[PDB]
């Protein structure tokens, strides 16, 4: 994706999904015998994602105004947004789209929870 | 699922349960007040109503439906509206006046054009003659009540504290009082319209009698309603507390495992 | 003024410091409001 960003074009990247990536990263670590942290993940499982998603950016003019936009996906269990890895990534990104099964079945699709959903960039990146 | 979730749900019901039970004693208390309003209006019901039996009074129709503004009282408004509806087939061209919002809501979902006046903010204190009389004053004025050949009062009749009975009773206008079979059994002074007064007084009175019984019927239903709410609310609390304790114990074990795994290396 | 209303005035003058209990006062006060209904919408709410 960065090739496009670096060379004055625009790329969107979708990481589907980072829940599963962390699980893999844990496997590596455990078998390498790196002493685990919370829920058996590596101590730096936040850094795993934080450095990844920091690479999505809008570059300056001196760098040709190219951009990489990230839509990472995260899976919760039983609506537990308060879970470990969900909490990490929420604190990384610039806003969240929150989908609810309860809304899916009331007919609301996309099942977006407006109350909980934000996009911090706000009306700076919305058509006037 | 999570202790934090189960903590709030358990504590939420723990309140609903204490709520419904506080509203079940507030009901029981208000019930001593209720019979002092029922009996004292059922006795004024023998005396007021007896004239009409002896005079043998009989008879576009005006329906007055009576319940209240407040829910949490079983099927009080549901089946009363069902009695009015059942009656409303036999004459769909009736004009409805609603005393209470809950009953207004019920009949507005089914007969919105028939409703011409709604009396509000009722269910709070016990019914008084002032409300009774001022509603009556509105019917006579705005609804032009005196001109309908038929007036009906629907209200709940409290047979006991365990169940009630949706009821009906008629209010006779001046014309009908005058022309009754045995109206000339009484030495009535033919002068200053007595049938007029007797009608407009009975219009307030039998409304109050109705409200006073409907009230009593509601308070005894709300009590029984809260009584089961508290029973279920309390039974749920047991199942959730049990769930809590599992989830508490599980949180201790799982933290202890992480810590043991971490030290293992 | 209807005959019931006429009787209220007299009954509530028969009221209007002691012997003037709680349920006595609260018989001289009504929280009720009337709202007329047509076609249903209404003719804006008013005290009784």
Curated annotation (Swiss-Prot), chain A:
Changing residue 93 to I: In ATP1-1; growth-defect. It comes from the Eukaryota. Changing residue 1 to D: In ATP1-2; growth-defect. The record marks 117 as: Required for activity. GO terms for molecular function: ADP binding; ATP binding; proton-transporting ATP synthase activity, rotational mechanism. It is found in: Mitochondrion inner membrane. Its main location: mitochondrion. One of its GO terms (biological process) is proton motive force-driven ATP synthesis. Keywords: ATP synthesis, ATP-binding, CF(1), Hydrogen ion transport, Ion transport, Membrane, Mitochondrion, Mitochondrion inner membrane, Nucleotide-binding, Phosphoprotein, Transit peptide, Transport. One of its GO terms (cellular component) is proton-transporting ATP synthase complex. Belongs to the ATPase alpha/beta chains family. Mitochondrial membrane ATP synthase (F(1)F(0) ATP synthase or Complex V) produces ATP from ADP in the presence of a proton gradient across the membrane which is generated by electron transport complexes of the respiratory chain. F-type ATPases consist of two structural domains, F(1) - containing the extramembraneous catalytic core, and F(0) - containing the membrane proton channel, linked together by a central stalk and a peripheral stalk. During catalysis, ATP synthesis in the catalytic domain of F(1) is coupled via a rotary mechanism of the central stalk subunits to proton translocation. Present with 41500 molecules/cell in log phase SD medium. F-type ATPases have 2 components, CF(1) - the catalytic core - and CF(0) - the membrane proton channel. CF(1) has five subunits: alpha(3), beta(3), gamma(1), delta(1), epsilon(1). CF(0) has three main subunits: a, b and c. This is ATP synthase subunit alpha, mitochondrial. It comes from Saccharomyces cerevisiae (strain ATCC 204508 / S288c). The chain holds residues 291 to 418 of 545 of the full protein.
From Swiss-Prot, chain B:
GO terms for biological process: proton motive force-driven ATP synthesis. It is found in: Mitochondrion; Mitochondrion inner membrane. InterPro entries: ATP_synth_F1_ATPase_gsu, ATP_synth_F1_gsu, ATP_synth_F1_gsu_CS. The keyword Hydrolase does not apply. GO terms for cellular component: mitochondrial inner membrane; mitochondrion; proton-transporting ATP synthase complex. It is a peripheral membrane protein. PROSITE patterns: ATPASE_GAMMA. SUPFAM superfamilies: ATP synthase (F1-ATPase), gamma subunit (SSF52943). Disulfide bonds: none annotated. Changing residue 253 to A: In ATP3-5; dominant suppressor of the slow-growth phenotype of yme1 strains lacking mitochondrial DNA. Its main location: mitochondrion. GO terms for molecular function: proton-transporting ATP synthase activity, rotational mechanism. Coiled coil: none annotated. Keywords: ATP synthesis, CF(1), Hydrogen ion transport, Ion transport, Membrane, Mitochondrion, Mitochondrion inner membrane, Transit peptide, Transport. Pfam families: ATP-synt. Present with 28100 molecules/cell in log phase SD medium. PubMed:12898710 reports two tandemly repeated copies of ATP3 (ATP3a and ATP3b) on the right arm of chromosome II in several laboratory strains, including S288c. This has not been confirmed by the yeast genome sequencing project. F-type ATPases have 2 components, CF(1) - the catalytic core - and CF(0) - the membrane proton channel. CF(1) has five subunits: alpha(3), beta(3), gamma(1), delta(1), epsilon(1). CF(0) has three main subunits: a, b and c. Belongs to the ATPase gamma chain family. This is ATP synthase subunit gamma, mitochondrial.
UniProtKB/Swiss-Prot annotation, chain C:
Keywords: ATP synthesis, CF(1), Hydrogen ion transport, Ion transport, Membrane, Mitochondrion, Mitochondrion inner membrane, Phosphoprotein, Transport. GO terms for biological process: proton motive force-driven ATP synthesis; proton motive force-driven mitochondrial ATP synthesis. Its main location: mitochondrion. Pfam families: ATP-synt_Eps. It is found in: Mitochondrion; Mitochondrion inner membrane. GO terms for cellular component: mitochondrial inner membrane; mitochondrion; proton-transporting ATP synthase complex. One of its GO terms (molecular function) is proton-transporting ATP synthase activity, rotational mechanism. Gene3D superfamilies: ATP synthase, F1 complex, epsilon subunit superfamily, mitochondrial. InterPro entries: ATP_synth_F1_esu_mt, ATP_synth_F1_esu_sf_mt. Present with 4280 molecules/cell in log phase SD medium. F-type ATPases have 2 components, CF(1) - the catalytic core - and CF(0) - the membrane proton channel. CF(1) has five subunits: alpha(3), beta(3), gamma(1), delta(1), epsilon(1). CF(0) has three main subunits: a, b and c. Belongs to the eukaryotic ATPase epsilon family. Mitochondrial membrane ATP synthase (F(1)F(0) ATP synthase or Complex V) produces ATP from ADP in the presence of a proton gradient across the membrane which is generated by electron transport complexes of the respiratory chain. F-type ATPases consist of two structural domains, F(1) - containing the extramembraneous catalytic core, and F(0) - containing the membrane proton channel, linked together by a central stalk and a peripheral stalk. During catalysis, ATP synthesis in the catalytic domain of F(1) is coupled via a rotary mechanism of the central stalk subunits to proton translocation. This is ATP synthase subunit epsilon, mitochondrial. It comes from Saccharomyces cerevisiae (strain ATCC 204508 / S288c) (Baker's yeast). The gene is ATP15.
């Amino acid at each position: 994706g960065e090739w496009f960003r670096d060379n004055g074009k625009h790329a969107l990247i979708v990481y589907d999904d980072l829940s599963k990536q962390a699980v893999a990263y844990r496997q590596l670590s455990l078998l390498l015998r790196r002493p685990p942290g919370r829920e058996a993940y590596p101590g730096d499982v936040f850094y795993l994602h934080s450095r990844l998603l920091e690479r999505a950016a809008k570059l300056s003019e001196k760098e040709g105004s190219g951009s990489l936009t990230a839509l990472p996906v995260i899976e919760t269990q039983g609506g537990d947004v308060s879970a470990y890895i969900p909490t990490n990534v929420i604190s990384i990104t610039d806003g969240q789209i929150f989908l609810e099964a309860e809304l899916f079945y009331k007919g609301i699709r996309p099942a977006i929870n407006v109350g909980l959903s934000v996009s911090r960039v706000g009306s700076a990146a919305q058509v006037k | 699922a999570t202790l934090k979730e189960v903590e709030m749900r358990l504590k939420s019901i723990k309140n609903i349960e204490k709520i419904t039970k506080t509203m079940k004693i507030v009901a029981s208390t208000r019930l001593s007040k209720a019979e002092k309003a029922k009996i004292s209006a059922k006795k004024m019901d023998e005396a007021e109503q007896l004239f009409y039996k002896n005079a043998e009074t009989k008879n576009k129709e005006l329906i007055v439906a009576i319940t209240s503004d407040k829910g949490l009282c079983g099927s009080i408004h549901s089946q009363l509206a069902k009695a009015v509806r059942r009656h409303l087939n036999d004459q769909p061209n009736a004009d409805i006046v609603t005393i209470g919002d809950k009953i207004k809501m019920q009949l507005l979902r089914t007969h919105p054009n028939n409703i011409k006046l709604s009396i509000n903010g009722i269910g709070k204190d016990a019914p008084t003659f002032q409300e009774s009389a001022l509603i009556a004053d509105k019917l006579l004025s705005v609804m032009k009540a005196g001109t309908y050949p038929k007036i009906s009062i629907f209200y709940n009749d409290p047979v006991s504290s365990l169940s009630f009975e949706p009821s009906e009773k008629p209010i006779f206008n001046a014309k009908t009082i005058e022309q009754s079979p045995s109206f000339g059994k009484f030495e009535i002074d033919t002068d200053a319209n007595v049938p007029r007064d007797l009608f407009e007084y009975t219009l307030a009175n039998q409304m109050l009698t109705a409200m006073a019984q409907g009230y009593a019927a509601e308070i005894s239903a709300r009590r029984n309603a809260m009584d089961n709410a508290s029973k279920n609310a309390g039974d749920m609390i047991n199942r959730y507390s049990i769930l809590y304790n599992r989830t508490r114990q599980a949180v201790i074990t799982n933290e202890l495992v992480d810590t043991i795994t971490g030290a293992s290396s | 003024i209807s005959y019931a209303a006429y009787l209220n005035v007299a009954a509530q003058a028969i009221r209007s410091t002691e012997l003037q209990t709680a349920s006595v006062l609260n018989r001289s006060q009504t929280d009720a409001f009337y709202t007329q209904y047509k076609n249903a919408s209404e003719p804006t709410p008013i005290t009784k």
